[PDB]
Amino acid sequence: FGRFTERAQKVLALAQEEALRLGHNNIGTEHILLGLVREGEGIAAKALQALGLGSEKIQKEVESLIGRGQEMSQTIHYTPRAKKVIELSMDEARKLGHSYVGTEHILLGLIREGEGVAARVLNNLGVSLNKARQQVLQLLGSNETGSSAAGTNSNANTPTLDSLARDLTAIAKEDSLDPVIGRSKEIQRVIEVLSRRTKNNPVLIGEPGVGKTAIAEGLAQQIINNEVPEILRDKRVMTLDMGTVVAGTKYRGEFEDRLKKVMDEIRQAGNIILFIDALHTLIGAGGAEGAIDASNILKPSLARGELQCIGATTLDEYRKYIEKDAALERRFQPIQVDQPSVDESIQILQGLRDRYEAHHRVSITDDAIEAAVKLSDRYISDRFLPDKAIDLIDEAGSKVRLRSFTTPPNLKELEQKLDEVRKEKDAAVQSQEFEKAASLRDTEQRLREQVEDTKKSWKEKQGQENSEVTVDDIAMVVSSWTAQTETDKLLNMENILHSRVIGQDEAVVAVAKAVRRARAGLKDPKRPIGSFIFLGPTGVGKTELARALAESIFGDEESMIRIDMSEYMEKHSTSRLVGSPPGYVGYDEGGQLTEKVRRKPYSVVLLDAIEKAHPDVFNILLQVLEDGRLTDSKGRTVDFRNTILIMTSNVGASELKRNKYVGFNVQDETQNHKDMKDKVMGELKRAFRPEFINRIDEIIVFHSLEKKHLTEIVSLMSDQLTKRLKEQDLSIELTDAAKAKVAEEGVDLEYGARPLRRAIQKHVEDRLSEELLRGNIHKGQHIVLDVEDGEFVVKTTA
Amino acid sequence: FGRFTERAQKVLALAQEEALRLGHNNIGTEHILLGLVREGEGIAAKALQALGLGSEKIQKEVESLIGRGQEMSQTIHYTPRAKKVIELSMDEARKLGHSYVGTEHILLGLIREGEGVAARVLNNLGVSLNKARQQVLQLLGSNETGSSAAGTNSNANTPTLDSLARDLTAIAKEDSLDPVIGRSKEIQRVIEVLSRRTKNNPVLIGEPGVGKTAIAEGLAQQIINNEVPEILRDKRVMTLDMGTVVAGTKYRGEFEDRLKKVMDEIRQAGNIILFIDALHTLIGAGGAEGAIDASNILKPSLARGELQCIGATTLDEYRKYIEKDAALERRFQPIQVDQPSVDESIQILQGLRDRYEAHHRVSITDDAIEAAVKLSDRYISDRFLPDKAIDLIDEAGSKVRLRSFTTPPNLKELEQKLDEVRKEKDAAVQSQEFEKAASLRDTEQRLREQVEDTKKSWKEKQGQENSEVTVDDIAMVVSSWTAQTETDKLLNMENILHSRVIGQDEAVVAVAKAVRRARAGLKDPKRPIGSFIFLGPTGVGKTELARALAESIFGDEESMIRIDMSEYMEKHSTSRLVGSPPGYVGYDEGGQLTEKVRRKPYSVVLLDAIEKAHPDVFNILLQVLEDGRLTDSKGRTVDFRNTILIMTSNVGASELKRNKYVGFNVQDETQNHKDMKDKVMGELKRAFRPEFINRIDEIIVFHSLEKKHLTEIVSLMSDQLTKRLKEQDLSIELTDAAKAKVAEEGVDLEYGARPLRRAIQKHVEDRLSEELLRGNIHKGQHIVLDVEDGEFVVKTTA
């Protein structure tokens, strides 16, 4: 463990004393034994002395074994035996509780480690090996705390508390309990519901979930001192443990008998508080089958206020309790439960910081902690508000410890050397090559010790790293699943969205800033952190931006939903379909849209082409744009809170598409920019509603296939070519000159970014592949796509 | 076998020594026995010396049996008795461990082989048979290699580490464990989670289905060399396996008890790591029923980081564990896992080459590994990227070893000869035929030995064949199952695609090259290896190519899906074919398209008539064409990555029936052709979106055909005709003259190579059948359909 108590460590160290004092150059097990008895009256020492083995008998034997007197010690270390006695005692102290290790455990461990020299010393001195282990054991000394033993007696208190179960108050009066951080404000509202007896019973309804039980520990504590009513005179709080009841009975009838028995002993009534966890399950109300029907005893118990109790139920479970009534409802009574808010989250993190010292990789920083919470809270969100957080802390709370030993100065090389030695050595001893092996051992064990020395020279790499969890550290980890490298994502959002997305710098910056505005909590984020209309012809920058947003906001690109509203049809297909039209919009509301965004809570919902794609859909989406929610799928609420709603359009497209390229225009270009930033968003308005648009964060125009925007679409598609072939092993690069020649062919006033795929396909994919067919390039060489003089040329550079 | 130790073999060989030295024509068991005791102090020998059976006692009995004087010792081999002892001992040493037979096993085996000459020698010399077999056994301490035995240590470690389990770490120190190749990049992020305390649990989410258990070996190894974190410098890695828990238990209550005890023993805390496969199952993993509700113990165990544990969870199941919280979600952490890419595949294969040395058509070649891998990985594809591969390697890695012994010069005939002998002899001995039986044995056993001598002369046919597993070998086998004779299929694709699309050489060569382009790693395999539209009139080469491509790429024609998009038009066939097919394109997405192509992954998706199929179809096809995926059927991903999208269409019909016809002019023909490969592809654009067409890899017109090309379509139809009649034994052949007469019909602007089917039907099946009925020809005659003076005449050539 490396955390041992003195008594152990001292008897062990006393061995080393005998090592040199007798010369035994490896500190033997005989010396560990001497160690016990020469340490006088530790439990080990004492023990041996009980059986009659004083220091006198032991050293007399010991000196007659290895004895004299080469006072040094060889690398002053132990015998392997003696090292075993230390390992053993540690476990012999685990067994006997003891987190650390005490004297006894060393003698106990000696007996255990019985081929050791000590063992034989004692078996020579007339005392059986087991007589020695006996003595130590029966003087059971180990680490202690959590005292609650001093003798106790009562009469009637016996029947209740036996069964079933732990007493929450008890564990909080010896404080082996911890607060734990709630869910504090809930507790006051419970004591209102509890210092009752006309409806005696609190019943907590809500998500369970971070630990319902935190509220419960609340009650215990407040019921003792002193804000507790005299309504609640001389109360005791006792907790239900379902697990003990079911265990050892293995039948429902027996289980019922035990619960019945408990209800009877509750006859101490009007002075008792019962905590019933999962209170509905016992009542057994509703469903196809019940849920366990303890209810026969439990229901009248609840009514009487003898089982004046606190019920911990769940969202559906309360329904299934008032469903019985009026004693499972005229006793029962629901209460609004807390699950920790964002600020509470931060506090929890820190609260368990100090136990992360056990792994030594966080404690600190606060700033990082905040990140854990906040960045996660707003951007995915795949856990609850504090759970998300803590996971990030620890995630980063290891991350740097990995970079520690991946790169110290890399005495990883040291170990690498030591390897080569052993081999040489080994095989040399085997080859003979004998004295040529000699030196090979010596070089080996030299190395071994050096190796071990420089890996604990990276205890300096520990005192450097072994507890922080920094801003960036947490933030990067927050990006890995999902302040610094999530808020650097936020601050540098424009930069990040541009680096994947096209020459529609107008569009990128508008979206970037609009999301970054909301996502930093200064603009309405109850509804998407950006609602948008993305105008432009398809493949221009629109989709690409949806992707880049996912990437920047959440730290992963693949948190992007994508629904085509135009695909929902049969919405006027009365008898036209056949005789009924069962489906598509019904599928979208009733299942698809609501389930999907509920699945990935935050995610770029990319709602394709809603230019005329069921005018009802725009209203449905409007509720998302306003509230951040839709209610469909028979009562599910889908949170589009920090989704990025991107509603696409290609009705403005025509003007967005327009040129800026030379070779054919020099004045239409400087009339295409200015034209697109006004005209596009107005072909939009006719294709939507202003009511829709009013709940949108910003209306984005993707000035496209410019001069400029083209050679960036070409650089996305062509770069996807050069990358998709490397898995199958081909290295492609297009020079800027070759990406340019393709870009000329997607522009004018008319077309889209549609012909760009086809021409990239032709000039890169098809051409290179026809270039493997012509033998200039091959598979797995580097292919530079160049222009020779105005005629295309595929060059090779590998 | 051949897996024998010396001592065994030596006592046995000593038998042969006695064979001639005492003269035993076949050297009895008595000589093996003499062998044992004269080999002195091998365990058999040694044993006999205990029983009192020195060389003295044995040889006196032996010499009184035979003892003299067949000094030649007839073709010096053993007796069947003595041979039995050798066969027996090998296994009598397997039985007692040993894969290499020791002395003991031969004496043990003598007793076993107790009728034997040896056995009887000893039972004559006063030593009971079991007293002897005992003696060897009680002087055989048995093997202790591959293990470590010298004593034990430790106390508390006992209950935990016992249970439960194998311990990969043990086999990874004292090697017996595989590397494995991995799934290496997963391990850093995993070790990150064991360098933590709020997070504690790495939890691997992905297909299980990657050989997840390989990753598990990862930790052990990596915690050793060379990244060593602070708590993972005192961590131990312990494996928990479900299989031992279920066995001998057979009760859920008992199962819970066993787990509770284990979890309790984890009190060695802050020093232990638990590997839990199927971590979700224990938690409850949502659902309509629990998956096991170990969760009660498991959750606090997860939270403290006492049981920092490693979760192997499934796609839905993980969701249903992080939902439980905040200990099955606090500890939890998702991680990105690997299922091998093509390069990784290759490396695994090679690593395990050396053990199908044993399969003697393997180990080697590298190039063969590559063939296996690359061809399966990219082309159908029925497992994971390395599993597919090795089956092909190994297929071939035996295949030629089969050709070894089914084609040497085929000394199988020898055995055939030997048959006639034995019989003749046998029956001759029974009839008598005294000397007529005599000579028959002599011919029999002479022959027999010659056979066997030359069957192991094809150990030269082994020394010839027994490694190598080449490219081509693999490739042919990959075609057998489903990188030379699959990449020769690619390079020579034009020949292969033409041999069924005999006609439209223009079209064929474009497609051939387009797939061959992609499959050689330089085109687009993200998109289908070739997406195409094959334009043409039906029954011209279009469909026929879809098949021929399947054949060439996958080695099988029938890996071809086939969807009519005009049926999934939701307005062409929703109300004149079917009732309510959830609004027909909804049927296609929601079920049909996605299920079909997902079943055979890289199937030729053959999309009929995309002229009109509703504009909704074209978006879906565009996505198939672009991404190489479609996502439908409530979250299924259907892989169109290296599918062959082949879309047929009569879209530009007029040109797709303006053949190559002599009718208008003979200067019209290569002007119907060249014209058709341009004019069609613009009616294509008019009938369906250009955006769709731009992600198509190449737009093929599979021309409408006029002789030249007709008489080659006629020759496909006629060859399909004549061949389906061979199964029921009716042989037809058409002369080239007759294939010409049918082609005149397929001429003109007015039709393609369409009318040809009816006219092959009429002129081959129907005409030959009306001639088979007229007695001009008969069944199973080779039936020549010939032209006389310009009209058919059926000739016979049988």
Q: Of A201, A186, A188, A193, give the one whose Cα is nearest residue A321.
A: A201
Determine the residue of chain A that is closest to B514 in CA distance.
Answer: A766
Q: Residue B685: exposed, middle, or buried by beta-carbon count in 10 A (0-12, 13-18, 19+)? A: middle
Contact B229 A398 (CB under 8 A): yes
> What does the DSSP 8-state code read for residue B631?
E
- A727 closest CB neighbour out of B154, B330, B341: B341
All residues at 6 or more sequence positions from B271 whose CB lies less than 8 Å from its CB, including other chains: A1, B231, B234, B235, B236
Residue type, A318: Y
Residue type, B13: A
Which residues in chain B are closer than 8 Å to A727, comparing Cβ atoms?
341-342
Residue B225 to residues A191, A334, A670, B120, B298, Cα–Cα distance (Å): 58, 57, 63, 61, 30
CA–CA gap between residue B7 and residue B108 (Å, rounded): 13
Cβ neighbours around A493 below 10 Å, total: 26
User: Could you give the 3-state DSSP secondary structure of residue B639?
Assistant: strand
CA–CA gap between residue A625 and residue A630 (Å, rounded): 10
- Please state the φ and ψ torsions of residue B51, each to the nearest 5 degrees: -60, -15
CA–CA gap between residue A317 and residue A326 (Å, rounded): 16
**Is B497 within 8 Å of B548 (Cβ atoms)?**
yes
CA–CA gap between residue A196 and residue A271 (Å, rounded): 12
> What does the DSSP 8-state code read for residue B71?
T
* Cis bond upstream, residue B69 (ω within 30): yes
- Residue with tokens 């009716």, as numbered in its chain: B730
Q: Of B643, B650, B648, B601, give the one whose Cα is nearest residue B626.
A: B643
**Is A100 within 8 Å of A4 (Cβ atoms)?**
yes
CA–CA gap between residue B323 and residue A745 (Å, rounded): 52
Q: Of A727, A711, A725, A721, give the one whose Cα is nearest residue A763.
A: A721
With vertex at residue A714, the alpha carbon angle to CA A709 and CA A720, rounded to the nearest 5 degrees, is: 130
CA distance B732 to chain A (A): 41
> HEC states along B227-274?
CCCCCCCCCEEEEECHHHHHCCCCCHHHHHHHHHHHHHHHHHCCCEEE
CA–CA gap between residue B650 and residue B644 (Å, rounded): 19
CA–CA gap between residue A22 and residue B139 (Å, rounded): 42
Kind of pairing between the strands at A782-787 and A792-796: antiparallel
Residue B792 to residues B745, B776, B785, Cα–Cα distance (Å): 15, 12, 7
- Residue with tokens 């029974």, as numbered in its chain: B430
- B154 closest CB neighbour out of A88, A573, A728: A88
Residue type, A37: V
Cβ neighbours around B287 below 10 Å, total: 10
Determine the residue of chain B that is closest to A782 in CA distance.
Answer: B522
Which residues in chain B are closer than 8 Å to A766, comparing Cβ atoms?
514, 517, 523, 697-698
**Which helix or strand (DSSP H or E) is residue B396 part of?**
helix B387-403
Exposure letters A657-677 (e unless 16+ CB within 10 A, then b) = bbbbbeeebeeebeebeeebe
CA–CA gap between residue A782 and residue B372 (Å, rounded): 25
- Please state the φ and ψ torsions of residue A205, each to the nearest 5 degrees: -125, 130
**Is A343 within 8 Å of A445 (Cβ atoms)?**
no
Contact B691 A538 (CB under 8 A): yes
CA–CA gap between residue B624 and residue B275 (Å, rounded): 41
Half-sphere exposure of A91 (CA within 13 A, CB side): 23
CA–CA gap between residue A498 and residue A509 (Å, rounded): 8
Half-sphere exposure of A257 (CA within 13 A, CB side): 7
Which residues in chain A are closer than 8 Å to B227, comparing Cβ atoms?
402, 405-406
CA–CA gap between residue A221 and residue B126 (Å, rounded): 89
> HEC states along A73-117?
CHHHEECHHHHHHHHHHHHHHHCCCCCCCCHHHHHHHHHHCCCCH
Residue type, A21: R
- Residue with tokens 């599928």, as numbered in its chain: A587
Kind of pairing between the strands at B308-313 and B272-277: parallel
CA–CA gap between residue B772 and residue B798 (Å, rounded): 14
**Is B481 within 8 Å of B390 (Cβ atoms)?**
no
CA–CA gap between residue B110 and residue B350 (Å, rounded): 44
- B229 closest CB neighbour out of A402, A755, A765: A402
- Residue with tokens 């309405």, as numbered in its chain: A524
> What does the DSSP 8-state code read for residue A79?
-
**B534, β-bridge pairs:** B648, B700
User: What Rg, from alpha-carbon coordinates, does chain B have?
Assistant: 38
**Is B491 within 8 Å of B516 (Cβ atoms)?**
yes
**Is A656 within 8 Å of A537 (Cβ atoms)?**
yes
- B583 closest CB neighbour out of A1, A243, A581: A581
CA–CA gap between residue B725 and residue B716 (Å, rounded): 15
* Cis bond upstream, residue B363 (ω within 30): yes
The dihedral sign for the CA sequence B276, B281, B283, B286 = positive
Cβ neighbours around A114 below 10 Å, total: 17
Q: Is A583 annotated as a binding residue?
A: no
**Is A632 within 8 Å of A644 (Cβ atoms)?**
no
> What does the DSSP 8-state code read for residue A337?
P
Determine the residue of chain B that is closest to A773 in CA distance.
Answer: B517
CA distance A142 to chain B (A): 14
Determine the residue of chain A that is closest to B585 in CA distance.
Answer: A567
Q: Residue A151: exposed, middle, or buried by beta-carbon count in 10 A (0-12, 13-18, 19+)? A: exposed
Which residues in chain B are closer than 8 Å to A381, comparing Cβ atoms?
none
Enter the tokens of residue A319: 């329904």
**Which helix or strand (DSSP H or E) is residue B307 part of?**
none
User: Could you give the 3-state DSSP secondary structure of residue B506?
Assistant: helix
Q: Of A465, A345, A357, give the one whose Cα is nearest residue A403.
A: A465
With vertex at residue B295, the alpha carbon angle to CA A216 and CA A346, rounded to the nearest 5 degrees, is: 50
- Residue with tokens 């009542």, as numbered in its chain: A283
**Is B113 within 8 Å of B29 (Cβ atoms)?**
yes
Can you say how many angstroms the Cα of residue B563 is from the centroid of all Cα atoms in its chain? Answer: 30
Q: Of A692, A542, A545, give the one whose Cα is nearest residue A621.
A: A692
With vertex at residue A789, the alpha carbon angle to CA A783 and CA A790, rounded to the nearest 5 degrees, is: 90
**Is B215 within 8 Å of B187 (Cβ atoms)?**
yes
All residues at 6 or more sequence positions from A754 whose CB lies less than 8 Å from its CB, including other chains: A537, A538, A539, B690, B691, B694
Crossing angle of helices A387-406 and A471-481, rounded to 10°: 110
Q: Residue A586: exposed, middle, or buried by beta-carbon count in 10 A (0-12, 13-18, 19+)? A: middle
How many residues would you count in chain A? 798
Crossing angle of helices A103-112 and A43-50, rounded to 10°: 60
**Is B76 within 8 Å of B28 (Cβ atoms)?**
no
> What does the DSSP 8-state code read for residue A727?
G
DSSP A573-611: -TTTSSS----THHHIIIIIHHHHHHHSSSSB-EEE--S
CA distance B408 to chain A (A): 39
All residues at 6 or more sequence positions from B100 whose CB lies less than 8 Å from its CB, including other chains: B3, B4, B5, B93
Kind of pairing between the strands at A629-632 and B272-277: unpaired
Which residues in chain B are closer than 8 Å to A725, comparing Cβ atoms?
521-522, 525
CA–CA gap between residue A149 and residue A152 (Å, rounded): 8
- Please state the φ and ψ torsions of residue B523, each to the nearest 5 degrees: -105, -120
Enter the tokens of residue A586: 């019904």
Q: Of B657, B647, B651, give the one whose Cα is nearest residue B620.
A: B647
Method by which the model was determined: cryo-EM
Contact A582 B579 (CB under 8 A): no
Contact B580 A576 (CB under 8 A): no
Q: In what order do the strands lie in the sheet with B792-796?
A: B731-734, B782-787, B792-796
List, comma-separated, the residues after which chain A is broken, a break being a C to N distance over 2.5 A; otherwise answer none. Answer: 482
**Is A511 within 8 Å of A532 (Cβ atoms)?**
yes
CA–CA gap between residue A79 and residue A100 (Å, rounded): 23
Determine the residue of chain A that is closest to B159 in CA distance.
Answer: A95
Enter the tokens of residue A531: 């609602």
Cβ neighbours around B295 below 10 Å, total: 21
Residue type, B255: F
> What does the DSSP 8-state code read for residue A636?
E
Residue A302 to residues A287, A746, B237, B351, Cα–Cα distance (Å): 22, 77, 49, 69
Cβ neighbours around A697 below 10 Å, total: 25
All residues at 6 or more sequence positions from B371 whose CB lies less than 8 Å from its CB, including other chains: B392, B393, B470, B471, B472, B473, B474, B475, B478, B483, B484, B486, B487
Q: Of A210, A181, A215, give the one whose Cα is nearest residue A336.
A: A215
Kind of pairing between the strands at B203-205 and B308-313: parallel
Which residues in chain A are closer than 8 Å to B613, comparing Cβ atoms?
none
**Is B24 within 8 Å of B73 (Cβ atoms)?**
yes
Determine the residue of chain B that is closest to A595 in CA distance.
Answer: B634
Cβ neighbours around B175 below 10 Å, total: 8
Enter the tokens of residue A528: 């998407």
Residue B458 to residues A597, B396, B446, Cα–Cα distance (Å): 68, 20, 19
**Is B208 within 8 Å of B335 (Cβ atoms)?**
no
User: Could you give the 3-state DSSP secondary structure of residue B621?
Assistant: helix
**Is A508 within 8 Å of A501 (Cβ atoms)?**
yes
Which residues in chain B are closer than 8 Å to A412, comparing Cβ atoms?
226
CA–CA gap between residue B673 and residue B658 (Å, rounded): 8
CA–CA gap between residue B163 and residue B266 (Å, rounded): 13
> HEC states along B703-716?
CCCCCCCHHHHHHH
CA–CA gap between residue A31 and residue B475 (Å, rounded): 71
CA–CA gap between residue A491 and residue A512 (Å, rounded): 9
Residue type, B690: P
Which residues in chain A are closer than 8 Å to B154, comparing Cβ atoms?
87-88, 91
Tell me how far apart the terminal alpha carbons of chain A are, to the nearest angstrom: 56
**Is A285 within 8 Å of A294 (Cβ atoms)?**
no
CA–CA gap between residue A128 and residue A108 (Å, rounded): 13
Q: Of A118, A110, A157, give the one whose Cα is nearest residue A136.
A: A110
> What does the DSSP 8-state code read for residue B147?
S
**Is B79 within 8 Å of B117 (Cβ atoms)?**
yes
Residue type, B760: I
CA–CA gap between residue A198 and residue A641 (Å, rounded): 42
Contact B196 A780 (CB under 8 A): no
Q: Which residues of B are annotated as a binding site for ATP?
A: 206-213, 536-543
